[PDB]
Symmetry: C4
Subunit: 388 residues, 4 copies
């Protein structure tokens, strides 16, 4: 086994094709399925695995009540092969209400945060063993990506924030080798608030596209230079913006360095990446809430804060169906690195009062250099008919 260098060009992309659906909730009206949230996908060199933070309970289960809650000691990171839904034989790989995993070509790294809000613990687990742990530095909800980390030449990076959800917070980038935190750069550049980054390998370094929970409804970018541990940061220029909430298509605007100050509060995890001076991005369809899910290309949207020219729209989930978190992952082809993404399909509380639980299912698309059509692929469960 050799370490992944990811030293290949990005695959040509014309949009994304259908790849996976798990049907989790539909399956839990007549099965034993875990209650989850903040799912994501990552792949070893052969195949892809789906992750989630469980709630330490199944759905048809009295312990399902009040699983809207985001941190409990009973939360663990679930790991299955992609498209094997989270059944009772599912492996909980570490204790965590916040997590990030990646495979460096030789083994899996997992980053797992659990414990008190003010004194949380991050564990670093590699080749099935604990190798390290750092402590919460600002004492306010140590948290990480909720999607895959990236590993170049055996050096894996992960972005972590401790701090205010609504003011300056303390963001750091760790560099992990065979499970050991070898360096710790602190955030730099113009990004003013950073959360749940969707990172991808852009040789010779790593690029991430994040959530700004404070004053931006445009999206932070982070460059990460893997050799000298340096960081620069900014915002996704595209005048069509990827956070939720945000203003409508006619009003909005963006900046290449600063938060647009537009409904900037709150947000949703999301993803975008670059194709020359253009930008591929996904986002919710509804501008203020977590309904529907679209991707597209904005022409010159990577390098022009004034561009609002989308081509290649694809509806993933239609505006009548709930979406949620979403992130990126990278798959290595014979000739190129492909970009793929997942979409958390949230059901239940607080938005849906037909039940007492909160959970998700998931849908995964992958870039293609070929052709595709339309469709829609929601969660498809009926809550009025669900275990009451």
């Amino acid at each position: 086994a050799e370490y992944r260098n990811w030293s290949k060009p990005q695959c040509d992309i014309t949009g994304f094709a259908p790849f996976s659906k798990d049907n989790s909730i539909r399956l839990s009206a007549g099965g034993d399925i875990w209650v989850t949230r903040e799912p994501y996908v990552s792949c070893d060199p052969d195949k892809c695995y789906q992750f989630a933070l469980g709630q330490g309970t199944t759905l048809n289960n009295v312990h399902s009540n009040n699983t809207v809650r985001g941190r409990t000691p009973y939360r663990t990171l679930l790991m299955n092969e992609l498209g094997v839904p989270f059944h009772l034989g599912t492996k909980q790989v570490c204790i965590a209400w916040s997590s990030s995993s990646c495979h460096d070509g030789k083994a899996w790294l997992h980053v797992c945060i659990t414990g008190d809000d003010k004194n949380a613990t991050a564990s670093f687990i590699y080749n099935g063993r604990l190798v390290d742990s750092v402590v919460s530095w600002s004492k306010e909800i140590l948290r990480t990506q909720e999607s895959e980390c990236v590993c170049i030449n055996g050096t894996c990076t992960v972005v972590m924030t401790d701090g205010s959800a609504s003011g300056k917070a303390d963001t750091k980038i760790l560099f992990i080798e065979e499970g050991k935190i070898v360096h710790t750069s602190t955030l730099s550049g113009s990004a003013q608030h950073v959360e749940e980054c969707s990172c991808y390998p852009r040789y010779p370094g790593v690029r991430c596209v994040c959530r700004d929970n404070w004053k931006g409804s445009n999206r932070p970018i982070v460059d990460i230079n893997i050799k000298d541990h340096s960081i620069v940061s900014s915002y996704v220029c595209s005048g069509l913006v990827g956070d939720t909430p945000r203003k409508n298509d006619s009003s909005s605007s963006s900046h290449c360095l600063d938060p647009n100050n537009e409904e900037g509060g709150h947000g949703v995890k999301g993803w975008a990446f670059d194709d020359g001076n253009d930008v591929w991005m996904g986002r919710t369809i509804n501008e203020t809430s977590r309904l529907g899910y679209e991707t597209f290309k904005v022409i010159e949207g990577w390098s022009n804060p004034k561009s609002k020219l989308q081509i290649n729209r694809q509806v993933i989930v239609d505006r009548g169906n709930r979406s949620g978190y979403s992130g990126i992952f990278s798959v290595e082809g014979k000739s190129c690195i492909n970009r793929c993404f997942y979409v958390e399909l949230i059901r239940g509380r607080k938005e849906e009062t037909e039940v007492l639980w909160t959970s998700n299912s998931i849908v995964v698309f992958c870039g293609t250099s070929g052709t595709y059509g339309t469709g829609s692929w929601p969660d498809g469960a009926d809550l009025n008919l669900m275990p009451i």
Copy 2:
């Protein structure tokens, strides 16, 4: 791991021996089992896998109501080892209301079609990743085999159809190397309508025996040449025809070039293969309905359209129980390529109104050069006793 070439002669066949039964429905009365239809069987160099098209629901499950429906955004392609019923630990390999799959000696190809009726998308998945996709070309229910594809020297082939189900349609044959659509030949020859081909290797090409849904109760044949991509086609000469509905044995007739025009409309997926000038074929035992299942050799049935001389019959499913789709697969023996087939045993709606769902189980026989006896192997669930 070298590519499969299948460059061994077809095994001496005196008939078929019992190979596999999954018992899916009876089990789903006392366990959480997937609702499925359109199963098939394919096998890697070491062992055999069963596939099927899930309904994103288990049987004892409120979402099972209405699963008679062909295309939903929740249908996914399920894959287990042969004889492992579709339990909740079953992997979904892609989103699909129409698929095919083959292993090429090195890795699995899946051809998965999902999306809108008028704008379907086919994804091509190889060695664990999306490598390609085509849109619907005629915008009228893009569909493929519902059984194994075939790969020789690392080029795999699949047959797809877009367009009318009761008039001329647009059938193409795709050639695929490591998940990459490398050529697209268009259908040619006498065959006038084509659906759901059951293809076998037959060095140095591939042979398919399909379903004409338009004016044929005789079955289409499709020859595929692999090195130059040329396609010819015709019908199965035998005067005892393989489709359902059809005319009875005294009344029916056939042609080697055109459809026969006898109850030709509609159909069922089925299979045949040649042995010199003789034809082995399975079919249903009722003329108009998917009841029972039989197999036999029609002597000179591959090259004389008047021949109705059948020998070596066997009742696979007795005339009073339910059959359905049926297809071939080829298994590489020590000295020869053998031929086997599964039979979909469809139960429930709309033919059976004791329940609200529609599902299948399966039985599998394999070619034998040895000896054998008689029996019947239906689904054997009581729908009078099933889930509410």
Copy 3:
């Protein structure tokens, strides 16, 4: 991977140590467990597998009614790693209401029989593909061992019977190389009725201890020469006799060549093996019924038929508890071949009328050259409480 030769001295045995137990019936009151009968154990070079004949149903399932029946089309051979109870992810490896399996060092052979009572088919499955089959020869319930077969230098041997359960039946021994029947030898020597042979390797031959459903309460021995395919047969001399029914310890007697004629009608599958001129053997504790199980050694039990001198008695299952079929299998130690055995633990109809089903769990013991104690390991379910 080399073939098994089994060419090592047989291990020293002082009695048997506990090895495995599946508590299947106990689990089936709070889980989905297969209904089975006629279980057995066979090991690959690395580890053991547990086998059984299914009823195409789990226990908490409406279809479990009249699982007393011994031949339906819904019966399959189930195969798990030893210890892993028959849950829904259990593989059904072939269609069988009578089976025998065994690993030759390179791959598994399975010998499965299904079909009509008067025309059944035995399928031979090797390295995951169908390689041969044979028709019933006497048209009267073709059956086989219901426990492991034995393979030497890549030649496997299995004993099958077809014919009357209460008169002269037609017993044959097959030699199967890589799934292919290379020879069929008919039964020879002095044994007058043969069924359900528990066979073990004994370099260079194979040897089997069987059941006489006809006139014997002593046990047929069959002896198979693997190179020149010769058969002899006789009975287990021991005045202590292993079949059930039988006369009591004081009243019973035996014979080295003929059936004792003492309560010979009916029987049970059991086992024995030589230890110089002595015999180790198991049997039900009760004379006329399938209650309790015991093993002991009988000094000069292999060669002198007047001997009734037992020693090293062990109670495996106490006399107030149900037992059943039992059979031998051999595990290869570093320097010698060990000998182990399984006791079927039958619960349900028609002996126990509290429930409508008929199922079993199992317990497994292995030869030791060490010291051991006492105990009793029954099935331990309470049927006064099981489903309905």
Copy 4:
């Protein structure tokens, strides 16, 4: 594949990081989970496994009543990958009401004990086959570690006891090569009563921290020389003692050689290990019943029976919640050997009478040389809302 030698220095330990939690009781409220007690953790070179002792029943079952009982013939030793809950497809690896396991580099070894209280039997199962067995010597409950054994150069040591739980009793140390009992030295030194040892490699020997159930709330230490098979023994010096029950912190005293005589009756399985002349150790928070769980470092606590200076306290389970047995396991890193530990979270009878069953879940923590914070990880099920 070479034997494990464990010939690396012990890793720096500043404390413990969260590693795994299995949430077994909460899951059993809506899913089929085994009833277990006396769980523990051991790892092959690649990955860890959670073992436990099954009550031969799942939780939602009639057979779960009276699982408070310690020894029945339905108990088996369960084995899953760490973080995979004891679901229906979990392997039962041998019959055991008391057990121990280690991997020696090449394969697994299981020491399992079952049978009559006064004539128990212990089976030694190595690389999937029974290699040995010894009877109960003092005919008063042969029992063993209930946590991992330890192997060095392919020789495994395990500690067993036969005799009184409140008096002199007979402890022995077995030395096992590939499942073969090669030698047996008996207990020697000032250790007066020894049970349930939590052992760990300490090249070139093995050391163990045990339970004294007779006169000592300090914990026996046992040192095992692997080369001359010689045994010394004593007690953990630290003034804060590891047993439950015990006196409070201002009353407690120890002794390096003899039992303290302080509420010395009864006990709980627990662990400690040396770090220079300091000791690392865990224990229940509450001094007299199994409530809460804590770990800390005692400065000079390994060598000075007067030292009561603890540093680095961590609460694993808060004092409102239930703990139980806890043991140690060792994990080989690149440079050094890490120490880890599990905690049993016992729920139900006798202490809690809302339900009729007794079962557990586990939480697991690992040595770290990095940093950490606080938290509490109880079992977290609601027995009020549990199955009747």
